[PDB]
Design a protein around this motif. Sequence first.
Motif, PDB file in Angstrom:
ATOM      1  N   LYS A  77       2.996   2.248  -1.817  1.00  0.00           N
ATOM      2  CA  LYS A  77       3.189   2.791  -3.165  1.00  0.00           C
ATOM      3  C   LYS A  77       2.151   3.833  -3.578  1.00  0.00           C
ATOM      4  N   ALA A  78       1.029   3.894  -2.869  1.00  0.00           N
ATOM      5  CA  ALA A  78      -0.057   4.793  -3.257  1.00  0.00           C
ATOM      6  C   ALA A  78       0.380   6.234  -3.042  1.00  0.00           C
ATOM      7  N   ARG A 137      -5.418  -6.536  -4.442  1.00  0.00           N
ATOM      8  CA  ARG A 137      -6.711  -7.073  -4.042  1.00  0.00           C
ATOM      9  C   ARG A 137      -6.597  -8.549  -3.630  1.00  0.00           C
ATOM     10  N   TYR A 194      -6.634  -2.519  -7.461  1.00  0.00           N
ATOM     11  CA  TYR A 194      -5.413  -2.990  -8.103  1.00  0.00           C
ATOM     12  C   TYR A 194      -5.372  -4.506  -7.916  1.00  0.00           C
ATOM     13  N   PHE A 218      -8.878   6.983  -2.388  1.00  0.00           N
ATOM     14  CA  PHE A 218      -8.361   6.202  -3.511  1.00  0.00           C
ATOM     15  C   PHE A 218      -7.183   5.324  -3.118  1.00  0.00           C
ATOM     16  N   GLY A 219      -6.428   5.771  -2.129  1.00  0.00           N
ATOM     17  CA  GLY A 219      -5.272   5.011  -1.683  1.00  0.00           C
ATOM     18  C   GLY A 219      -5.712   3.773  -0.929  1.00  0.00           C
ATOM     19  N   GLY A 270      -5.752  -0.388 -14.373  1.00  0.00           N
ATOM     20  CA  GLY A 270      -6.084   0.892 -13.743  1.00  0.00           C
ATOM     21  C   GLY A 270      -7.020   1.765 -14.547  1.00  0.00           C
ATOM     22  N   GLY A 312      -7.134   5.431 -10.748  1.00  0.00           N
ATOM     23  CA  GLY A 312      -6.343   4.355 -10.178  1.00  0.00           C
ATOM     24  C   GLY A 312      -4.956   4.549 -10.753  1.00  0.00           C
ATOM     25  N   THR A 313      -4.108   5.224  -9.980  1.00  0.00           N
ATOM     26  CA  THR A 313      -2.880   5.812 -10.508  1.00  0.00           C
ATOM     27  C   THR A 313      -1.846   4.764 -10.900  1.00  0.00           C
ATOM     28  N   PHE A 314      -2.056   3.557 -10.415  1.00  0.00           N
ATOM     29  CA  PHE A 314      -1.158   2.457 -10.704  1.00  0.00           C
ATOM     30  C   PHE A 314      -1.126   2.094 -12.200  1.00  0.00           C
ATOM     31  N   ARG A 325      -6.919   1.283  -3.160  1.00  0.00           N
ATOM     32  CA  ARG A 325      -5.977   0.535  -3.984  1.00  0.00           C
ATOM     33  C   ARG A 325      -6.076  -0.949  -3.655  1.00  0.00           C
ATOM     34  N   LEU A 333       0.823  -1.209   0.000  1.00  0.00           N
ATOM     35  CA  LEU A 333       0.000   0.000   0.000  1.00  0.00           C
ATOM     36  C   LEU A 333       0.857   1.260   0.000  1.00  0.00           C
TER      37      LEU A 333
END
Lengths: 307, 307, 307, 307
Positions: free
Chosen positions: A188-189, A273, A269, A261-262, C41, C298-300, A265, A186
């Motif tokens: 990385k968010a 998930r 993602y 949104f973080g 994403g 979803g920035t990833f 993730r 996480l």
Amino acid sequence: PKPYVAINMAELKNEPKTFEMFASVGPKVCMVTARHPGFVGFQNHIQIGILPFGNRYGGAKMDMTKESSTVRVLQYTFWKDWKDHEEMHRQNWSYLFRLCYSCASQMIWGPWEPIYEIIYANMPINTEMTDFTAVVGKKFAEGKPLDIPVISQPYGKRVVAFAEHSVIPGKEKQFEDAIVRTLEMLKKAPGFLGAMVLKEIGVSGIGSMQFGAKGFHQVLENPGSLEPDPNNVMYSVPEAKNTPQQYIVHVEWANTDALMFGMGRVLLYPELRQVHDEVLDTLVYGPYIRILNPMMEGTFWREYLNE
Amino acid sequence: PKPYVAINMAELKNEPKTFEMFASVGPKVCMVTARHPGFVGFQNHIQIGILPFGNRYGGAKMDMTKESSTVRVLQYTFWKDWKDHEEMHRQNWSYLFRLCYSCASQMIWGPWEPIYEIIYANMPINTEMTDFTAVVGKKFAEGKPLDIPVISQPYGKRVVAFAEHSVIPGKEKQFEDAIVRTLEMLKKAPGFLGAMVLKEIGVSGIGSMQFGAKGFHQVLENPGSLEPDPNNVMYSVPEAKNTPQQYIVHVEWANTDALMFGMGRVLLYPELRQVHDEVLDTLVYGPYIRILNPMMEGTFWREYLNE
Amino acid sequence: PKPYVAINMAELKNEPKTFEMFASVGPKVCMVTARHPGFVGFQNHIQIGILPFGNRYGGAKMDMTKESSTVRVLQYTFWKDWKDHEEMHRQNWSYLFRLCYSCASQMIWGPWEPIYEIIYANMPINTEMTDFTAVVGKKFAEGKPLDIPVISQPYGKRVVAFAEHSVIPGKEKQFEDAIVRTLEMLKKAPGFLGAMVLKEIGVSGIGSMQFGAKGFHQVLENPGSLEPDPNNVMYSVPEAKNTPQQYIVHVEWANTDALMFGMGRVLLYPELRQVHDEVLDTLVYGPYIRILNPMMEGTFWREYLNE
Amino acid sequence: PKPYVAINMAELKNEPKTFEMFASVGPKVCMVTARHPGFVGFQNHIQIGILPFGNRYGGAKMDMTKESSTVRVLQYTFWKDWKDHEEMHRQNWSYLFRLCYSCASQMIWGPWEPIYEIIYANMPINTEMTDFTAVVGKKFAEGKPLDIPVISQPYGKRVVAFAEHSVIPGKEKQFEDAIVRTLEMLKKAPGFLGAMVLKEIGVSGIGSMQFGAKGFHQVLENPGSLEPDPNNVMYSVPEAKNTPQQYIVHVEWANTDALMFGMGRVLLYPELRQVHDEVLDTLVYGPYIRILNPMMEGTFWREYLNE
Ligand SMILES: [Fe+3]
Ligand SMILES: [Fe+3]
Ligand SMILES: [Fe+3]
Ligand SMILES: [Fe+3]
């Protein structure tokens, strides 16, 4: 090293008088708490809202402060040894009780003060936006650019996701292993400011004003200037530890969008998930996510942490 | 005989739209629940306030409905066997989930549905003020004037003291013995309409929408017309039973004044105070007393009880 | 690697009810889409306005949100293979259709969902202003200061120029060569946050709710909880590819001024103007430039891109 | 090197007319003061409030500007030699008196102008947020990353804690040793922008408009354009030095929250509290902490300091 954490929780009327007393009495309590050499700092929060998870909690929003009739506080105090917290309350009882009692006129529920051990922490020192230049200079001078942290601004200038979990008996190891893997990914968010996992070890009866009959009557009958018998607490901290086991997953964020949104993730993602699903499989209760504002704090707790 | 009790707890926005929902959807849920032959009735409450205990909770009052931004509901359903409740949810899942989901837009916290066994009950059948003449006539005709109950009016015409307790491990027997002695004496207070003690035996994961990862995603992603997999509940009812042991002491009263002074009899009448002190000595948490209005109910649960 | 991009486009009423929907239903759709392992994403946009090009579109301005009766959305989802998008819709059809249908009351036009290949990308990971210190530290630690990106803030904190073009048949190569040269020069403009060129490869019938007769009637007749036959799509993705060939030139900027004058560099800086003239000579349609706010994302997806 | 500091103190009506004359006359006075080659710069403050220390000064708050009927100014001028200040006043008396006198209509108390030596200084050069990139570049180019300062923004974009102390005769050495240890630890608090300790050496009679009888009458009788006799000051600077010895502990902070909790670190962090206790044991008066806004300044004083 990792301190222990006591979290004093209460619900009060959402009105100016409440915040005025936060301002008068809050600093006093903190100063009394700091009399004990095991005190390594504090981080006091007001809940500003609840994460709605889409419309799972459709009546909630991340900032409910304008509409809410109550305010919830979660006051973290950090301790070299959890026993220090218990000693501090008893040694300073005359001051603390009388200061604490003064909040009475505003109280709806609480106080309730569980104690936690930190089983995982990735939490930076706080810095103001003015500090980063010197921090960078010093880390490069020391040849440690990897130790340059994100800018986690103190005193209400970031937000906290306070995620409540309780775990099926027998699945604690699976939960702990999976949540650490989750938080390691996480980080990385964007706007991630750190995370820690708190595992409940018990509850402070004295901090929760939970006495036997004698103390209960002393509390109910109190004019405000007479201590209940602090020896009338009928249970030790560990005797009150909950099963199902409770955990707080505490994650800090630059702002509420980065939080939504973080934290999201773990749902959006696919790679993360799959990992987070292993956490979900272990739960009796949760995740329920309160959105907190760390308004008043003694930032040096992170200095002790990161020694 | 004594039924088991499931209590569905939730917190929702305090606005007309919520109460409109209660009116549309509530009866439907109740009608679906009645599909199961083990269902013996229900008693649904809204919290109207909190007992302030003098000024221990000085920000509270017995009726906070005009000021509160939220409304808490506690929906009791009564079952011949607690397993009936679990079976009912699964057999009627398509209807129940879709009905219960419809409450989403108003939800802030919940649902959370613990299950209880009744370890003590002194609860009369309900009667309207129009009924008492016939009740009296019939009891005298049967030669049983002792079986004439107080008049406990249904449908929002009395109030409930909902007293939360959790008990120090090892002190459960002392608590249970003392609380029964207390309630046996409390029944002398004016306006006393009955009491029962509920002991938590576990939590319904399905009733609390607490699934493993698969069901969690299905709930979060739901358009409203697709069931999460009811087989994805990861724990049995007893696996979620709390330690410290939780109890509800549920006492009914003619009105809020009778409630305040009646519950107060355990603090004000020396003889009863000594007895109740034995309860107090056992507690980890409480007593915390919510004031409830039993608005919608299936009064026949008390007929089953008093068979 | 470069993902494929699906862009779901729709026009809806500009009113609170629409934005409330976005908030409830948007996250749900994103969570369903993330069930597929090819999903990397998303970046969802609301159009805030139109670039007036002086007074070429004298009735437009870059922010028309206060005056406009409609709101246009452009929802980018990113996929390892475009076939993944098609599979995801079909595998999750019951959830997606019912969620997407719920937007009906607000819809004026759409949905329409073309699919694109990325033929050029210079797009950085997103970072919040709190992150840059750690990013810098890590890049210097790795000996890669050249890999330190501009600060492209997520969640509505930057703006997008969405430039529509269609190209004369036979001039696709000239367009592609010239636009890349243009973008490579454009990156010098202040506040430039990245650019990519999207080339349409087809249209998703299923994502556009474009079925044969059977599905058309199912859509029109739908109560909201019954899927149209997803097998009733009458054309493959490539069968719907447009000629003249369509491209989107997607350029991100710190703010709307940096956008206006930055995009304007292709008209105001003689050296770049000469290069961009080669692009202009190839066009059937355009450039028409929509100003977008990337609000939910979803920035990833950029992490996948920049692997 | 360390300059000496003259601090001109006055209290004026809090109204627009006062601030208008700050704007007209202030720059003129500074320009006259800058005629003397020993002048190395200035830092002029308005008091915005008072630190309440919990509720020790419960009637105060950190920003009282909206409610206060008066405004207090503290104008620091810095000098190579304190005698330069005295010479400057006398050499430029006709300009300075007539300029200063123009403030008469707004004055309630003052002027009063003590003179200080700096016994400890940890004060950076000021920089605007636009400057830091070049400062960093230059320090790395010089191989001196340790010399990169925090960002201390000039012209009212930070705040000052002005902490007044007077010390028990005989305890000056203990005070000075302990305060330096305190400040060396305090620099760890987030948002710390620097500190210095000023030790009073005397008072400027001429700067305080404190003359013998002759000058007193000339001041009272003045139409505004006639100098009192500057040779009628009856005491030298050191003759007015106070006992108990007075000190100002001047600490600068990113904002008022950083100030409150940062200054609070000496009370909340046990390690620092033990050190600061040694300061407290020496005091006749204080600490009394004024919150100041450094609005108008000649930042080059810090360049002289840090040579
Ligand atoms: Fe405590
Ligand atoms: Fe149920
Ligand atoms: Fe799609
Ligand atoms: Fe002077």
